């Protein structure tokens, strides 16, 4: 009966790996070259995952592309937290298997505060008793959670489609939690969780772009496609031309 939820699980990506020299003593330059590799791989995986989404083929192929490029980091950060939650129970950061982040790597990467934030969201998963089905469904909602204020090439469709993903999230909660101030209690937190992802993303958007600019001066390598997105679409978000849709203000 869970037609929507079959799909989401059915289309779930594999455990992507970075290919990081775990035998080499840590260094900013080494660390961030694997995280850029990681980004670039996961991006591909996001692309294929996203195209299978129910009603995604509905969007105009530019919107299809745009929502991917805009929402791409937040998705990486969401799933990531679930990975560190379910693999390392939230003690470290399960980026990929070959790239798990301890405290000293967190600091050595120069994204410490930013990771502080992400280990929190990892902790949120447990604290809030997030279900696997609750995760997947929140995860899907996130591709539809960041519009350009400029206007999408076909907004109407996007809006219909988004409004539906919320129904589906409702339905996942309203299922086994039969009660008024329960479904209500839950949704709040979940939307309150989903919103909290955005600040993390924009921070990583700032670090990335920054690193990208000063990359000539650090020995850190941006994949052909990493670096186009970070230059072409990220500055849109950072310049405020693209904003996240928030549940609360």
């Amino acid at each position: 009966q869970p037609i929507f939820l079959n799909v989401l699980e059915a289309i779930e990506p594999g455990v992507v790996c970075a290919g990081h020299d775990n035998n080499q003593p840590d260094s900013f330059a080494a660390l961030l070259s694997s995280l850029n590799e990681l980004g670039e791989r996961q991006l591909v995986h996001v692309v294929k995952w996203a195209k299978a989404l129910p009603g995604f083929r509905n969007l105009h192929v530019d919107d299809q592309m745009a929502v991917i490029q805009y929402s791409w980091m937040g998705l990486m950060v969401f799933a990531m937290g679930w990975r560190s939650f379910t693999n390392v129970n939230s003690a470290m950061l399960y980026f990929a298997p070959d790239l798990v982040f301890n405290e000293y790597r967190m600091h050595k990467s120069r994204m410490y505060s930013q990771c502080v934030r992400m280990r929190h969201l990892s902790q949120e998963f447990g604290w809030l008793q997030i279900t696997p089905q609750e995760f997947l469904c929140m995860k899907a909602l996130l591709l539809f959670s960041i519009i350009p204020v400029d206007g999408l090439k076909n907004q109407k469709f996007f809006d219909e489609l988004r409004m539906n993903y919320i129904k589906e999230l409702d339905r996942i909660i309203a299922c086994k939690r039969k009660n008024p101030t329960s479904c209500s209690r839950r949704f709040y937190q979940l939307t309150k969780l989903l919103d909290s992802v955005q600040p993390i993303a924009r921070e990583l958007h700032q670090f990335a772009f920054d690193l990208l600019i000063k990359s000539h001066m650090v020995s850190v390598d941006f994949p052909e496609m990493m670096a186009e997105i970070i230059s072409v679409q990220v500055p849109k978000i950072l310049s405020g031309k693209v904003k996240p849709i928030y549940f609360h203000t």
Partner: peptide, 8 residues
């Protein structure tokens, strides 16, 4: 772009 042309 590089994304748009890998995408389609």
């Amino acid at each position: 772009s590089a994304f748009s042309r890998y995408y389609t």
